[PDB]
Design a protein around this ligand. Sequence first.
Ligand SMILES: [Pr+3]
Ligand SMILES: [Pr+3]
Lengths: 331, 329
Amino acid sequence: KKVITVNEWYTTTVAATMLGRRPTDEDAILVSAPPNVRIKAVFDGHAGEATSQYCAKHAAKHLGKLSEFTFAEVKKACLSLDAEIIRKLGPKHVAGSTGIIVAIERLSAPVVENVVGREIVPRFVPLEKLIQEEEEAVGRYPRVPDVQQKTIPAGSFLVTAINIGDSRATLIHSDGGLTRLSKDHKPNHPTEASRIEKAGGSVETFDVPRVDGVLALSRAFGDSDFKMNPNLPPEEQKVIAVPDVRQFYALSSDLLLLACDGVYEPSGMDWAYVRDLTVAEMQRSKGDLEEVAARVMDYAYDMNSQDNISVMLVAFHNQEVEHPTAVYKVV
Amino acid sequence: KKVITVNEWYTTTVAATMLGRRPTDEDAILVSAPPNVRIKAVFDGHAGEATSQYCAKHAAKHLGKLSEFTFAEVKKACLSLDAEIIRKLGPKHVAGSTGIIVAIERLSAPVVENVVGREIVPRFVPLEKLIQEEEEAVGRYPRVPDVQQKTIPAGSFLVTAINIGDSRATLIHSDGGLTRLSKDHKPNHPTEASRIEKAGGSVETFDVPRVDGVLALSRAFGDSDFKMNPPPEEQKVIAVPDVRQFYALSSDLLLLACDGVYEPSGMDWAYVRDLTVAEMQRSKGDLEEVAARVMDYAYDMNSQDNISVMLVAFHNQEVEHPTAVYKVV
Ligand SMILES: [Pr+3]
Ligand SMILES: [Pr+3]
């Protein structure tokens, strides 16, 4: 219902959030922050809103100083922020928060890269493959493409997806296809379970697999009580603030959609269904971004999601926006 | 309770809106639009949201083109936007919208002007005087000051208040004092009723004075059905704004709100100022909390309208890590 629309640089960004069936809304959205670099994010907090709101307000500060968006550089940036969060909000019982962050850069000239679909192979296992392995453990998603050399046209955007937790980012192509930019960090998955056990933790399933039978996520900012091993660095604790870092290219005709777990909780509503809703609403509404975000949010609520629901959509332009504006309206 | 906070340039701006007891929310807020000049605004629509939202999206397009924010130039800009609105959404039955717009210009060097309080005299009856005369026809507001020659320090902001309707803009000083940037456009006032009359219309009192017994406001964007006499500036309802010049210090707080915030009695200019000051203290300067709280008050005070508020704080230094954040509370 209540949507913010920012028209600036080479993008049109719309964002909205709702309490849903929860007493408070712990979701926070970084709508935009800065040469030729934009940073946007959706932070999903739990057990409090102090950490997610801190992240929204300060994540750009750390990521914004980076000269390259490599795993190593991004990793030190996230741990730096996490330490700052724990220091300022703790030291004990610090609320936690997921974080799906994107660093968007525009190409003013074409570039040649090796790619697997939209994922740029760094100069390796494509994320789509890893996601499909987890899903098997279907049919709604195409088989993983073979690597190929591609000339990414000027006007295209480089998108680095920095993920921590289970919020998600998706690129919807003009032809309807989609690229999954993130893979949820769950305690029961191999890499995560290994770290947890090494740090002296357990992974027990009640309603859902939980770390020490408490936390549903294996990675998150905050959550100070699960990072007190100190015989191990912060990056090897039960729960860590180390992100997965992947890069993809987006064409000016794409749509980038970031959403929290609340949108995908109904248990039917997967990446594919969300794409179908977006595609259908873009058609029916005649391309009104604000309405499509509002409709995907209502669908999730109507399908009985019991979580806060937040979505951010980004459309890209071939030319700089002439008259930038930031507008807040309803519907 | 959903707030947008934009930290950019030399300001921190927070905005929020709520349906309140209304079925829909037709308020639209222009949080910011561009050198060294901003534009911000609150548009309160009626009989539809198309017009208010159109204004938020395109007002700055027209105003931003201006070399100077004088009345002649601003009036041309507003009439142009109005024609465009009616041309795009009409011609007939176009929804209406009020408009409280502010053009903020930061000074890079001091300027010398003649002022009546914070109002700059063009090189005259101060706006405060008009408001006080109208309120009179026992004081919560100080007597109007004598004109003085002041040097506005660099780092200060020139603020042009462009009003069309009954939304309002207030400057809250660091010492608690307040400056009223606008005056409500009412159908029954001499200037308005006179124009309406000559246009073949009338003003009659029901729950409130109304144009032809229908519209609560005599000035607004859209409302094409009241602009078909055929000059645009002389129709029953017009989009000609009242334009006043002021100066704000980096220590002020600028508050823009729709009629919904002031609907309740006791919820007057002075009271909103009191609420804001109290909350800034109680929350140690949390702009988002003060915005939310002033809104809750209006609602608890039984306002039946949509509630929207925008607060702008100023800085002496350009923000170094600009952000636009949307959160709850
Ligand atoms: Pr959640
Ligand atoms: Pr109203």
